[PDB]
Design a protein around this ligand. Structure first.
Ligand SMILES: OC[C@H]1O[C@@H](O)[C@H](O)[C@@H](O[C@@H]2O[C@H]3CO[C@@H]([C@@H]2O)[C@@H]3O[C@@H]2O[C@H](CO)[C@H](O)[C@H](O[C@@H]3O[C@H]4CO[C@@H]([C@@H]3O)[C@@H]4O[C@@H]3O[C@H](CO)[C@H](O)[C@H](O[C@@H]4O[C@H]5CO[C@@H]([C@@H]4O)[C@@H]5O[C@@H]4O[C@H](CO)[C@H](O)[C@H](O[C@@H]5O[C@H]6CO[C@@H]([C@@H]5O)[C@@H]6O)[C@H]4O)[C@H]3O)[C@H]2O)[C@H]1O
Ligand code: NA
Length: 295
């Protein structure tokens, strides 16, 4: 039973993990174009503001649904356009540290991203739980895609909004790989967001990466309360803001319109590849959320 699977993160001395009722195991039916009350108690079937998404992404309410025990989301070409319509949902309640969140999900066999992530209301602070490009092969690039099919990107971002600037860690351990081809099975991807300076990432019940301390979480002081980006003064908040849970797929600009301008680094679904619905359907069996409490 999903609620009983041990939590791999450590609740602390004389502490236990308490299951949060905002968790969802998606056992109800929610039609794509008419979600119903069970879905809508916990989720909104869009991004958290009117933006339709990055790259070729054009999010749609009717590209997410719940059926046969899973949250599902799929992708179709927008008629007359290069854009791809695909799903995005947002939690109606926010979470904050200390909190352990884990999704059991199956990365798509697509060049599109399969995402489970956390984002503050003001778009300044973000934590990835799952961010993966699962395809075995890319027709757009004409190449074996196993460089990506074997990697999951585990990261966090802090932003300055105007003018827009984005920091994330970029060391090699931010892409996890152990030989697993992610698109073949459901796996459990979790994060313990312990405090503003400490994240632990877990895959299948095992600690795979720790990101801890000011020098990796915010070395450019984008989180200063006074004068973001000024490293001479330190009023950094860290990852302190409460966050929405977002589940989606995305086409990103660095993939569909790469810097190099080269077809060979261009990874985005062709019309032929979009004809396979299953390959472009992202499935989430459940998402469970726990808080540490005193015994
Ligand atoms: O064989 C091939 C192989 O060879 C090897 O040798 C190569 O190394 C391989 O390639 C490698 O891959 C990686 C390994 O090294 C590099 C190599 O190429 C590479 O590293 C990647 O490189 C890239 C850098 O170029 C990437 O950046 C990539 O990182 C990505 O970074 C982001 C994007 O996706 C994730 C990747 O890590 C990541 O993190 C988040 O992911 C989520 C989805 O899960 C989102 O995409 C999120 O994006 C953000 O979301 C919100 C918050 O901020 C914005 C941002 O997009 C956004 O906010 C909205 O922003 C818009 C404007 O865009 C509006 O402001 C909107 O606001 C609203 O606008 C209107 C309407 O309402 C209001 C409101 O204000 C307004 O009126 C905002 O809400 C991501 O952060 C990197 O790792 C190989 O080739
Ligand atoms: Na389920």
């Amino acid at each position: 039973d999903w609620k009983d699977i041990p939590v791999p993160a450590d609740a602390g001395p004389n502490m236990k993990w308490e299951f949060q009722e905002i968790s969802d195991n998606f056992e109800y039916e929610a039609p794509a174009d008419n979600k119903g009350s069970e879905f809508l108690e916990k989720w909104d079937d869009f991004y958290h503001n009117a933006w339709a998404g990055p790259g070729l992404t054009e999010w749609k309410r009717d590209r997410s649904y719940v059926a046969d025990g899973e949250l599902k989301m799929w992708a179709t070409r927008k008629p007359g356009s290069d854009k791809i319509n695909m799903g995005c949902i947002t939690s109606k309640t926010r979470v904050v540290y200390p909190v352990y969140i884990e999704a059991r999900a199956k990365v798509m066999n697509s060049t599109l991203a399969s995402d489970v992530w956390l984002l503050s209301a003001d778009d300044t602070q973000e934590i990835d739980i799952l961010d993966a490009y699962g395809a075995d092969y890319s027709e757009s690039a004409g190449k074996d895609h196993s460089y990506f099919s074997k990697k999951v990107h585990i990261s966090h971002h802090v932003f300055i909004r105007d003018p827009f600037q984005d920091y994330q860690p970029k060391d090699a351990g931010s892409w996890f790989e152990d030989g697993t081809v992610w698109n073949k099975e459901f796996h459990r991807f979790g994060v313990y967001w312990r405090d503003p300076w400490h994240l632990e990432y877990y895959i299948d019940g095992v600690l795979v990466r720790t990101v801890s301390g000011k020098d990796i979480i915010d070395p450019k002081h984008f989180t200063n309360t006074t004068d973001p980006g000024n490293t001479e003064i330190d009023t950094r908040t860290g990852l302190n803001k409460e966050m929405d849970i977002i589940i989606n797929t995305e086409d990103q600009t660095w993939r569909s319109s790469p810097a190099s301008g080269l077809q060979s680094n261009t990874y985005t679904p062709t019309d032929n590849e979009l004809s396979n619905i299953e390959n472009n359907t992202f499935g989430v069996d459940w998402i469970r959320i726990y808080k540490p409490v005193e015994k």
